[PDB]
Amino acid sequence: SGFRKMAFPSGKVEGCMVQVTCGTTTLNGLWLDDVVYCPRHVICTSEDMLNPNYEDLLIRKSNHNFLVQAGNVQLRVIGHSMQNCVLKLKVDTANPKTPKYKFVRIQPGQTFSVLACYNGSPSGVYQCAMRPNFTIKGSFLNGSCGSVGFNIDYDCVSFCYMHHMELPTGVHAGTDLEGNFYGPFVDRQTAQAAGTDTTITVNVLAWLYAAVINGDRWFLNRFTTTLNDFNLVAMKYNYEPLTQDHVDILGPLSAQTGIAVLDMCASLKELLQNGMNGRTILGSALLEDEFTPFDVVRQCSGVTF
Amino acid sequence: SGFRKMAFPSGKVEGCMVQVTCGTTTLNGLWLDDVVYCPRHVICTSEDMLNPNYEDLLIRKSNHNFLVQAGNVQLRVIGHSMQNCVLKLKVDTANPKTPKYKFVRIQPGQTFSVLACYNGSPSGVYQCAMRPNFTIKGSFLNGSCGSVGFNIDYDCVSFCYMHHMELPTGVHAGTDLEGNFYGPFVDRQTAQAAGTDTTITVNVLAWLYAAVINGDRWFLNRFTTTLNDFNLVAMKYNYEPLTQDHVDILGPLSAQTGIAVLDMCASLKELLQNGMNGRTILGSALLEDEFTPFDVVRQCSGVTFQ
Ligand SMILES: *[C@H](O)[C@H](CC(C)C)NC(=O)[C@H](CC(C)C)NC(=O)[C@H](CC(C)C)NC(=O)OCc1ccccc1
Ligand SMILES: [Cl-]
Ligand code: NA
Ligand code: NA
DSSP states (O other): OOOOOOBOOOHHHHTTEEEEEETTEEEEEEEETTEEEEEGGGGOOHHHHHSOOHHHHHHTOOGGGOEEEETTEEEOEEEEEEETTEEEEEESSOOTTOOEEEEOOOOTTOEEEEEEEETTEEEEEEEEEOOTTSOBOOOOOTTOTTOEEEEEETTEEEEEEEEEEEOTTSOEEEEOTTSOBSSSOOSSSSOOOOOOOOBOHHHHHHHHHHHHHTTOOTTOOSOOOOHHHHHHHHHHTTBOOOOHHHHHHTHHHHHHHTOOHHHHHHHHHHHHHHOOTTOOBTTBSSOOOOOOHHHHHHHHHTOOO | OOOOOOBOOOHHHHTTEEEEEETTEEEEEEEETTEEEEEGGGGOOGGGSSSOOHHHHHHTOOGGGEEEEETTEEEOEEEEEEETTEEEEEESSOOTTOOSEEEOOOOTTOEEEEEEEETTEEEEEEEEEOOTTSOBOOOOOTTOTTOEEEEOGGGOEEEEEEEEEEOTTSOEEEEOTTSOBSTTOOSSOSOOOOOOOOBOHHHHHHHHHHHHHTTOOTTOOSOOOOHHHHHHHHGGGTBOOOOHHHHHHTHHHHHHHTOOHHHHHHHHHHHHHHOOTTOOBTTBSSOOOSOOHHHHHHHSOSSOOO
């Protein structure tokens, strides 16, 4: 028993992290097969970052202007190209530690593990969610750009996030590994802000199921509701709408615990309307929304990789 | 910016995890150099879990009664010995993935990463703290025994915990890597219970300093306190006593933020009295006590958001 914010084991990703330096800028790169992926703003000076013309800045660079270091070994760059907001540096050696992997783009509300890195060296690992406002509440300091987020399935690493920037409220923005930003953000030093966020309803419900599985039941009640009635409450409390697909996805947990989703929605309805009355759930005084239904099933059944 | 429960990258430990089987019992082992470490209760049988005589159980085993599997490879056991509550199986192959490592026994309040494993394969990684009552609040299922806790400050893995058991409140108990339990617990299924737990005061103060570093001051006040008056109040909320050692350890965070330690103590006193009035601190509505002063300096900027 027990329930913790749990990240995937990071070893398969650790073996892919390298240091990329261009001019005075050093950040992290991801070395897979014979290509190193990193943020394209590595080629910028501070002057450039105000209003960068990335097409123009890139032609001015040669393969020897990119210094790529895997541990204490320099990698020789033999080509360079841009894909959206990601730079792709072809190197002369395929990474022998390349895991089975694919690039995926995730949806808001989905969770992933972040391997925070500095100077090409992994430093920490933690679990995040893509927020509805397309930010992540990460923990990043200067030099963390190029750190990546991922999920694992059996032996396949699904890379979903590359870190690019911090917004004024202290939350973070980045791209998929094909260089497309999550959210309405750009890689230039202009006025940008996180939009108003909302709470991920289906994940709160998943975590209430985790609580019941771990013996925390005080919030259960005799009542049920309907999707329409509950979604009017969700809107009121800046919760994401609950769809029928969400209900279907929670089906397993409903069957296991004997609490129908709309039954649990009646519990969440009451928690939103009344609060927790001084009590806690799984050690939290807030309604936690960064566990997905899959995360709950995976942790409570001990799936391995 | 930001503040997360941050674990160490687990790869160095993943490369050491193996499966150990004796009889019908399978759990995890830790393969370092030519030795596999695992909980000695792998040699128990179902009928004899209350009062196992481990010396008598072990003398009846040969090396080939232990099946050690590293991924898809069977390792050959060529010797065995018991050290306290850990079994040490000598194998015929040194682990080529052995990191630089050491064994350290930790004190209550210290934190570490756990790599939860089943059948020698990793499931996930998370942060824990050694509670004042010598338990940890982990996430462990059947077969998780032999999973380990560790830190990796400066590219050396310090192993500090090996998982052995779950107590009735759902919390967890285990040993250091020399096999000595944390706390008064024994590897027997006789009735045992964790002591009343308390909050790790020095860690709460560290986390309040982290909040200031990251730009939040709403919880501070104009007051101060003596150390003794603080402890008289904090103990009424089941907080651990704050010692002069703890005050000294908080010095660097006090210096970076300009908030004297006993002034932060006065802030904590008021928070215990008032709650948060609908506010949060670093994304929490409770006072967090599983970040150490060392953890805050590890994760936070050296420059305060003034
Ligand atoms: C090993 O994988 C397993 C891990 C647990 C998380 C399940 N450990 C054990 O099975 C362990 C073996 C004994 C010999 C140390 N037993 C326990 O952990 C046991 C609970 C299990 C059966 C779920 N706990 C236990 O016996 O605590 C003592 C006790 C006894 C009676 C009443 C209260 C407490
Ligand atoms: Cl310690
Ligand atoms: Na109900
Ligand atoms: Na020791």
